[PDB]
Design a protein around this ligand. Structure first.
Ligand SMILES: Nc1nc2c(ncn2[C@H]2C[C@H](O)[C@@H](COP(=O)(O)OP(=O)(O)OP(=O)(O)O)O2)c(=O)[nH]1
Ligand SMILES: [Mg+2]
Ligand SMILES: [Mg+2]
Ligand SMILES: [Zn+2]
Lengths: 381, 152
DNA sequence: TCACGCAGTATCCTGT
RNA sequence: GGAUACUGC
C-alpha cells in the first residue's frame, strides 16, 4: 500500500463505500430522543494534520455532503452535547456540557510491549494477536455478565489494537464517576514501566478475577508456552524469576538448567510454587501480568473523548476499522482486513448495493446485525 | 442586551461565547455567522431605540428643560432642573447663583393594621402632592424667608 | 467632571 | 456598631 495513494482513493471510498445509512442508524438511535444526532460531536483530521472539532450535522444528507466535501483522513466520534457543537460559540459559558456518550474501551498492543517478545512498538504478528483475542473475551464477558450491557460493538483499530463501544442506553447516561468506577473494576494490571510486579492479588480471589483467570487458562499454554516461549532462554525467564519471591529463585534456576521445553519449565515452576501456601496465587499473578488487558482509564473516564470512528481508514496501514464478530473471534485476522486500495480496486472492477460486491460486505453485515439488535431493544422496550 | 431584547422586543438573542470568536476563524460559515450575529445585535439595538421613543422623548424633555440634547441622553436629573430654573429666573430679571466649583424630615407612613381583608378597600390618593403643595402655599425662593435646621 | 429627595424591609459580619 | 442589596412614596 502506498500512502501517497491515500489522497487519490479517499474520495471514492467516501462516495461509494462508506456505509452512511447504517452509520446514521447507529448514531441516531431510532430518533427516540430529539436532537440526539443533531447534538453529536464529530472531529475531522484533514491533509497535513489539520484538526477540526465541534462539527455537527442536521441529518444524513448534510453529513454525506460535508464529508464528501472535506475528504478527511481521520474521523472521530465524540459526545452528545447539550446543544449543537457547531453553535458552541453561541452557547453561554458553562452551558455547553457533554451529556451522553457510549462507554468505550481502547486496548492497544503498544501497552503490552514490556511483556511481548515477538514484536515491538507498532509491529504485530500472528504470535502476539492472541493477546487481543484474550482481551475481547475477558472484557466482553464481564460487560455481558457483571454489568449487564447488552449492545457491544467491537471494532479493529486498524493497526495496534481494538476498541469497544458499549451503547446500551444505560451505558450512554453514565456519569464520569460511574465510568471511572467501571474502568477501575475491570482493571487489574496496574503500574508503569518502573514497576516489576504489577499484579498483587489478595488471599480471596474475587469472582471476576477467577473468571478472567479461567478465560486466560484456555489460551495460556498456546500463547505463552508455545508461541511466545516466555521461558526460551535466561534473558527472558530471568524476568519471571524476578516476579516471584527470591526464596525459591535459586531452586528454580537449577531446574531451568535441566529443562528442554518451556512447557516443562512451566510444569516445574508450578510444582515448585505448590510445594512452597500464601504464594499459591503467584502463578496466577504471572499469568495475569502476561495476559490480562491493560486499560487507559483516561480513555474511558472522560465524556468528551474523541475515539476513532468505525469504518475509518488507517493513515498508515490503510486497513478499514471493521467490526469483529464475537462468535467468529477466533477466526479474526488483522492482516486480512480490507485495505482501502484493495476495495477501490474491487470497486473499479464491475447504487445502494455497491459495497456488497467488495470484501467489505461481511463486516457491514455484522454491523447491520448489531444495529438490528439495537433496534429490537429500542422497540421491545 | 439579552434581557433588554427579551423584555422589550420579546425575542430571543443568541450569545457568541468570548472564547469562540477567535476559533471561528477556521471556516467561512462560522465567520459569516459571527458577522451576521453582529448585524442582528445592531438591529436589536435600533429596534429597542425605536420602541421606547428615546429620541422624541429626549427632544421633548430637552425642550421643556432647556439643556443640550446630549446631556439629556447622558442621563441624570440635576442638569435638567438646573437649566429649567436658570431659564425661568433669567427670563424674569434675576441674578442666578454661581455654578459650584437623612438631612431633613420626609413623608409620614401611618402604622398599618396588618392582616387580610376580604371586603372592598378604597384607596384615596392625592394628585401631584408636592407640586400642588408648592403651588397652593406659594413655596418659592422669593416667598419663604430662610436663614442660614428649623422649618420656616 | 458627576451625582433628585426621604422612609422602609431583608441579609450578613466583627482574629491577628 | 458596620457593611450589601432594592422597594415604596
Ligand atoms: N424626589 C422624589 N419624590 C418622589 C418621587 N416619587 C414620588 N415622590 C414623592 C413626591 C410626590 O408628590 C409624592 C406622592 O407620590 P405619588 O407616587 O402618589 O405621586 P404624585 O402624588 O406626585 O402624583 P400621582 O398620584 O401619580 O398623580 O411622593 C421621586 O421619584 N423623587
Ligand atoms: Mg399621588
Ligand atoms: Mg442599632
Ligand atoms: Zn508479534
Amino acid at each position: 500500500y502506498d500512502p501517497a495513494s491515500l489522497p487519490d482513493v479517499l474520495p471514492l471510498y467516501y462516495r461509494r463505500l462508506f456505509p452512511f445509512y447504517q452509520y446514521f442508524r447507529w448514531l441516531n438511535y431510532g430518533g427516540v430522543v430529539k436532537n440526539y444526532f443533531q447534538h453529536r460531536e464529530f472531529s475531522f483530521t484533514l491533509k497535513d494534520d489539520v484538526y477540526v472539532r465541534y462539527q455537527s450535522f442536521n441529518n444524513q444528507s448534510e453529513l454525506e455532503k460535508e464529508m464528501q466535501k472535506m475528504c478527511p483522513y481521520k474521523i472521530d466520534i465524540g459526545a452528545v452535547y447539550s446543544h449543537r457543537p457547531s453553535l458552541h460559540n453561541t452557547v453561554k459559558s458553562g452551558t455547553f456540557q457533554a451529556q451522553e456518550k457510549e462507554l468505550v474501551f481502547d486496548i492497544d498492543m503498544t501497552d503490552y510491549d514490556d511483556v511481548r517478545r515477538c514484536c515491538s512498538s507498532a509491529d504485530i504478528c500472528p504470535k502476539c494477536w492472541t493477546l487481543m483475542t484474550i482481551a475481547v473475551r475477558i472484557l466482553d464477558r464481564a460487560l455481558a455478565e457483571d454489568f449487564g450491557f447488552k449492545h457491544r460493538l467491537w471494532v479493529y483499530s486498524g493497526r495496534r489494537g481494538v476498541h469497544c463501544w458499549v451503547c446500551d442506553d444505560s451505558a450512554r447516561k453514565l456519569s464520569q464517576a460511574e465510568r471511572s468506577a467501571v474502568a477501575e473494576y475491570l482493571s487489574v494490571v496496574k503500574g508503569g514501566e518502573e514497576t516489576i510486579k504489577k499484579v498483587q492479588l489478595p488471599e480471596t480471589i474475587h469472582p471476576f478475577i477467577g473468571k478472567s483467570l479461567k478465560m486466560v487458562e484456555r489460551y495460556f499454554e498456546k500463547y505463552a508456552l508455545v508461541d511466545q516461549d516466555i521461558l526460551e532462554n535466561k534473558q527472558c525467564w530471568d524476568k519471571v524469576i524476578a516476579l516471584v519471591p527470591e526464596v525459591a529463585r535459586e531452586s528454580l534456576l537449577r531446574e531451568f538448567s535441566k529443562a528442554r521445553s518451556s512447557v516443562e519449565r512451566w510444569d516445574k515452576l508450578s510444582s515448585c510454587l505448590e510445594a512452597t501456601r500464601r504464594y499459591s496465587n503467584i502463578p496466577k499473578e504471572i499469568m495475569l501480568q502476561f495476559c490480562y488487558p491493560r486499560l487507559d482509564v483516561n480513555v474511558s473516564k472522560g465524556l468528551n473523548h474523541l475515539l476513532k470512528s468505525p469504518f475509518s481508514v488507517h493513515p498508515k496501514t490503510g486497513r478499514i476499522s471493521v467490526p469483529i464478530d464475537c462468535k467468529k473471534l477466533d477466526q479474526f485476522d488483522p492482516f486480512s482486513v480490507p485495505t482501502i486500495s484493495l476495495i477501490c480496486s474491487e470497486l473499479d472492477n464491475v447504487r445502494t448495493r455497491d459495497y456488497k460486491r467488495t470484501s467489505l460486505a461481511p463486516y457491514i453485515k455484522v454491523f447491520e446485525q448489531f444495529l438490528d439488535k439495537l433496534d429490537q431493544s429500542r422497540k421491545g422496550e | 442586551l439579552s434581557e433588554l431584547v427579551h423584555q422589550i422586543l420579546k425575542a430571543e438573542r443568541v450569545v457568541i461565547p468570548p472564547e469562540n470568536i477567535r476559533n471561528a476563524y477556521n471556516d467561512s460559515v462560522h465567520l459569516l455567522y459571527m458577522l451576521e450575529n453582529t448585524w442582528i445585535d445592531a438591529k436589536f439595538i435600533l429596534q429597542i431605540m425605536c420602541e421606547l421613543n428615546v429620541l422624541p422623548l429626549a427632544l421633548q424633555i430637552t425642550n421643556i428643560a432647556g439643556n443640550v440634547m446630549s446631556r439629556t441622553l447622558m442621563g441624570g436629573r440635576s442638569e435638567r432642573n438646573e437649566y429649567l430654573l436658570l431659564h425661568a429666573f433669567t427670563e424674569n430679571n434675576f441674578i442666578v447663583p454661581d455654578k459650584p466649583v437623612a438631612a431633613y424630615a420626609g413623608g409620614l407612613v401611618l402604622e398599618p393594621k396588618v392582616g387580610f381583608y376580604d371586603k372592598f378597600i378604597l384607596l384615596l390618593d392625592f394628585n401631584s402632592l408636592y407640586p400642588s403643595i408648592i403651588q397652593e402655599y406659594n413655596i418659592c425662593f422669593t416667598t419663604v424667608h430662610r436663614e442660614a435646621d428649623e422649618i420656616p
